[PDB]
Design an enzyme around this catalytic site. Sequence first.
Site: not given
Lengths: 458, 458, 459, 458
Positions: B112, B152
């Site tokens: 991430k 995202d």
Amino acid sequence: NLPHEPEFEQAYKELASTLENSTLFQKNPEYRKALAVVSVPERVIQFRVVWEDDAGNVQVNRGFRVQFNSALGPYKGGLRFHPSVNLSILKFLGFEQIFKNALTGLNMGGGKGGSDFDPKGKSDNEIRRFCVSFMTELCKHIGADTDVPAGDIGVTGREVGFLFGQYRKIRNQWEGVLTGKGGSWGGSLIRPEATGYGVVYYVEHMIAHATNGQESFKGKRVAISGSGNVAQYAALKVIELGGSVVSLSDSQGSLIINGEGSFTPEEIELIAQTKVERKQLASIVGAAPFSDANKFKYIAGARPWVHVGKVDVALPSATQNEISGEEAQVLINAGCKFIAEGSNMGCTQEAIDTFEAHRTANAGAAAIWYAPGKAANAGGVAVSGLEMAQNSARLSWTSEEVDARLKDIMRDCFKNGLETAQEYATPAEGVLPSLVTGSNIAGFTKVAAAMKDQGDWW
Amino acid sequence: NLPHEPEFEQAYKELASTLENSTLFQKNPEYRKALAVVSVPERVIQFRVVWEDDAGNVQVNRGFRVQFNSALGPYKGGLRFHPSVNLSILKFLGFEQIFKNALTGLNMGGGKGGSDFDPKGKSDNEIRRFCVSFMTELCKHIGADTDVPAGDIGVTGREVGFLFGQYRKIRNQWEGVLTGKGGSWGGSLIRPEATGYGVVYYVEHMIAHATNGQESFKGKRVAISGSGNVAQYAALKVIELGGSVVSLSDSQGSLIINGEGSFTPEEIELIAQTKVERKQLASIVGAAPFSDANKFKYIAGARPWVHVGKVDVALPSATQNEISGEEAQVLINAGCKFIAEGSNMGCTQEAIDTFEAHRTANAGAAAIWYAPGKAANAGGVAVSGLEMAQNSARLSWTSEEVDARLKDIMRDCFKNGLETAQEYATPAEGVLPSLVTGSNIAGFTKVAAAMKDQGDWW
Amino acid sequence: SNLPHEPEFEQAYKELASTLENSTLFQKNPEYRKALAVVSVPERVIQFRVVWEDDAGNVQVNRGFRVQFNSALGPYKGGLRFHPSVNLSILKFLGFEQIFKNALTGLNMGGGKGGSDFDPKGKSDNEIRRFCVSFMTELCKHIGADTDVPAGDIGVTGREVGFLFGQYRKIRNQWEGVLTGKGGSWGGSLIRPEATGYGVVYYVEHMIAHATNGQESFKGKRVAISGSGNVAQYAALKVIELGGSVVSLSDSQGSLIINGEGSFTPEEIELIAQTKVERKQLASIVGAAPFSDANKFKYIAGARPWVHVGKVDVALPSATQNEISGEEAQVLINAGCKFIAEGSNMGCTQEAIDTFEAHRTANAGAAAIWYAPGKAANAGGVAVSGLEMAQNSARLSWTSEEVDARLKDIMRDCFKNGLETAQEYATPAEGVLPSLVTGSNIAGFTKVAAAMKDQGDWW
Amino acid sequence: NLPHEPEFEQAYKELASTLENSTLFQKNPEYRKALAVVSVPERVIQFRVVWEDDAGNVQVNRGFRVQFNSALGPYKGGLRFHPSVNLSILKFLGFEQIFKNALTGLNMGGGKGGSDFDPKGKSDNEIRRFCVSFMTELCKHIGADTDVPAGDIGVTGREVGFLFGQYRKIRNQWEGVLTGKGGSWGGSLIRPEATGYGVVYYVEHMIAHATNGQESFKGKRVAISGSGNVAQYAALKVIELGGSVVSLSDSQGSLIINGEGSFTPEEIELIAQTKVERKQLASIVGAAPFSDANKFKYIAGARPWVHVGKVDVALPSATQNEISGEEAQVLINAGCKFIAEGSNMGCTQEAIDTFEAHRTANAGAAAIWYAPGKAANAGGVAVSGLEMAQNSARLSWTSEEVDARLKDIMRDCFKNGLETAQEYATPAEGVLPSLVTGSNIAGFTKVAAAMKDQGDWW
Ligand SMILES: O=C(O)CCC(=O)C(=O)O
Ligand SMILES: O=C(O)CCC(=O)C(=O)O
């Protein structure tokens, strides 16, 4: 929302404060943008380090490399293995390293790294396996043209070797990827002498400026504290330049000269042997040469400052806070004109403040002139630059060459302080510029203008 | 000595809890070592991002990439641009990503990243300059066989385009370095549909199992929250399967169906267009068809759950922590028997505890069955793996081929969770197995076992 | 020069060369004589020191090797061997064979072999891990998904492949198909355990079909197998699945035979597999059911199964290299065996091979025993490694049925190529079976040598 | 098991035996582990070399690079093209190269490579194509920071040029990847001089130590054999330092000085021209200046040793085994105190034995002191390092700079031998340390300790 990094925040706030108490932002307000850009590191790597202990069990620690700034050169700064290590501490140390390296005039950037690995209680086998694992990942991010680490707490010659060996194996290159290497595999001569020789050369440059090139260490009486390597080699250099070393000391007492005279190289080498044997200065006055009461006087429980009488130069080289505000006053009444820290933070804030008010209140060479540690004890960093220089040619320089070069680097270090203070904390007519203020600003200004030149900010 | 990272430490402690509350550590006590190792990220890169605003001023933000685990494949996971972003948060999201990716069956590690750059109020030019600057650094650390990011919060197709563009220019390779790419430049069909389709597909298996093959989405009443691409495509697939969709919502309120009706595809298309235009559901209720108060009721400030009345399935697809303990109980009273997260982290731990307590207390089809996001909303990252597969094949598959593989993946994900709970968290007779505990154990063991095989722990 | 004496390699070169000479190949294309001389010198050999720590904390030194023999057809491909006998000569021998075995699969795979003189015998898992880590720290430089893709062999199983993969991914920072024989969840292939065993049997299916004009198959045939590991097991189960009877298995201590008509069942093979997992003997299971039923099972210590099997139609050596002597070749001939293919690498001695071949050329039709060389008939293994590489590049895991289907097509084409190449270049006498040995050697060699010429490696 | 490598096994045994006949394994028995590790090469590359002959036919040869040890520096050592080349031979040479290179105190490791390619009867064109093909593979494995080859038998200037051209082309870098390069494209000044000058500097350091720095080459009579590059330059250096050169020779006879006197630089130049024209010394004595029988005496069929009278220094610089046991005794009786090998293996074992027994039997400057060629003719290697150093900076040093630096390197070579013999073959009080024993041990000890520091063994 940023994490809490108290040690780094403190270090940023101290820089921003010293920058504010100067004319830098009146003349160059755009450098406030530089301050903001520079204090976000260029790159930080964190990585898991898995290593095997002597029982065959899996152990886990955290590895770190903060590559803070590279405007002036590749990232340069040490590796620390200690259970307290974290990002915040390493950012604090790396941030400071930028500006101390900048101060020397060498093409060195700023970095810091290491691990929360605790070498206390570890077998050499364990330290080796840790180092191998640690360098396996770190290798990716460093190199002679990118980032050149070194030792620090928990990382000495032994660890540097293990680190170097694994880098070589993975990278298949022999290059100056670390400093502090063994003498046969890329280490530099003048490495043990670096700090002590460095302080004496810095002070030589101070004297030269203060007296317009008429005086040197020749004929001067010099009080030294300490008797480890920094003090020994500072003493040897002083003697070599024609100065008189009138004191040395340990934590238990001071060994001082009576009246005129000086320690000799032979005497210093005797004190070195006694230091190798863990023995205290108190125990060597029994025998010759130190039993001669007409040359030597041992004073129990004392620092040398109030006992050397009239003195020209003071060189604290023992430990932190070893010159009180009161001792600064006595050195002043003793006619001391030059003082520079060989030990890390050797002068108390009270002593620094004293020397600085004296400077401000007395024109020219009637002042006492204090040099801060980040400038005066940058010798070890200086020799690191020379080790890199030497490695790029797979060639070792002579003692004399490294020494001569160390001297020039300390001149650059001196001049960066002097000129910055002249420009941005301009003194009154005939007052010496502050080397403390100059040295605290000079790294930032050199880096900031370099960053501007290179389009890092605008 | 470690920094406080509460979001991450909570997720860790909670996973560890679900693993303890099972037979896993009885039959394999060694896996506790794996837990200590996997919880420390393989590698974290942080980096300064300098970019120029539309006024021509320098601006500074922080970049991040957490490469958490790569035992099953190259690091895979999104980039988030939001002013809340920091290391703790990305460690939290990246940790969860490991096990989600593990559960897809595909060779995809967990990672991430992102930045505290806020895209709110920025021009498209500013966003482009920011992405060019961000990718200039990030490119060194990623690659089609190293780390494959995606979008995202704050990073849509627009940003992925800018990021890809910059990577291709500096790396001089055209490759599957990102997913969520555009159709003509290496995108996959079904990627926009994947998360929403995927949760509905997963829940179909839940219905099948819990009703012994008696029932499907046919005739079910389905409460959905949100109205972005997840909610939309979940709604559409429910409709395709013969279910009724009785709510959608945004950050300002809930649009619910009165009586026994359902949203239509055409109405979903209209809500989708209103959303592209960044308008709100409250702005569209004053015109047809949504002004029809026989069919529709807008409720300002409200989540949909109380206002839908009796429902069979709940698909929270808006935002994190959008079902509380109170709402878990509302849904139980509504006769809801299936809940699966469309959105990331949709249910509070309180709602999860409530659902799990209910499952344990109520044998058979009387239980409300909760599926964790790491299983149920894996459809998105699954189709990203298929985007990577397609790029490596150098072909574009039809919608039917991508969709077929997505169904097989969600099927196998459900089966694995179910069978793993049956083995290590064996429920009493008639009691539905824990998809929470089963998915956690399944995901964790696949990683931990692969790590052991690859010598990461022993 | 004064070249070093490399007897294993030099012997294989001469035997290959001789089979090429006994054909029209160098009459039709005398220029391939230069191809052969060029192919015989490895493109690249890497040797290296491997330093590693034992559990006592002591430094140990072993030698590591990678022979990157030929890459005209694909990246270098071939296994790694950890065994005290390992040296350059031995790895050159095995690497040279690998070129042509890999060529016959029809996939884009070159030929290589490597390993170390490290002896795994008596070493802890931890020691093995430390050795693999240190071994791969140097090997990583020279290999890659598009460069050189190793695998296991003697001393390197899944355990070692794992430690080797882990260390590569850490230093290289790429997750890719750099090794085959990987584990199922980290890019392994279904059917890889079954590959070699299924493959021999699939190949033999085509032999039986061709020799009998499609009138026979494995159905109703008595098959003698040696060995009791993965190859022997899955060969056996495939034969059973085809309606044949497996009448022997064996390990290094003895053979376990079926008495009269009858066969091992899958259930019995499953039990045998469990005992070989436990590293036990076939010896120490005979006194316990069903292997104590002395009506069905006979154990003989110290023996291979060939003399004890009675009349047999197919033999599948699947234990070890050089496990059929020339004498045992005659025994099988006289037992009425008509089909032989190697499940073990180099199963038949050259003397046995010369005997099967003499017997083929002396007898028309299916009165002849037909021997298939290992480079054709046990390529099932490396074929599925190729398929593993393909799966990794596809970033997908195929199903059992898909890997298996492709394995079947590969073995079929490999058989066809050997058969038709022998018909073209080494035409047998009317009614004599085409030599699959000469056929396979020619087919493999010419594919490599022609590709080399296209690529300018020789001219 | 292991292949038979006779030449290497011999070289290994001689090292092991030298190390056993010293105190090394008594003081440091752990260095036996170093011996076992160091004697397995770090890396060996073999490769097929396909090249095209002048008739257009394919040819095949074997290429090799033995990268034996890199603890002290990147791999360094020559390339040999000769039909006898194989791995055993190249291991022999590369093994020896480690310890000779180490002896200089330069940061150079140890290696050797080449091919079984025979340049006898090849055209320049064929040699070009071979080199192109050879370097096409080798380029991968070498580099300025990794492995720096040079010439040897079959590889001179011409081949080095072809090899360097091809490296430059493929690698697209200009760097010091080979030594022995042409003057205009990275070669060093002092290269032709290096071996000859190097021998003389080494003897200067021997003289200084033996005499307390009371004597030098000044006033010394020096008997030299040979008349090629090494004798010529050795001679010229002696004359520059105030010494008298009293002989030179070739395979057919000796040309010696009659009475006291010396060859002059102009005379050395004349002898150099005659040697270029391939004329023997017998045929230059019929004209001036050499026809002057008051100065010059030609002695047909003789080596110079018994015909020069009293002499202080002997410098065999022609060929191998050119000082017999008898000639060693004659030199001792003539007052010779310093003997060092210009030529490789110039002293027979009888002679070496005789000089060593004499040293042992005669305290201080009464002794004759023999210096082995591995130390005394290491100047070629020394200038190689200087060529590397100069290439780093893309800069040629002056003749005077290279020359001064060569002198220093020969001092380090001397000191390494002297100090090592002092420690591990300690002579009786007043006796000179053995430079033969010292030089044969010193390289190994330096490498072994560096290996240990670097974690290669422990
Ligand atoms: O497709 C991707 O890799 C991003 C998806 C993601 O971050 C998620 O599953 O929440
Ligand atoms: O799986 C491979 O790469 C080949 C294994 C091997 O060397 C063999 O065929 O024996």
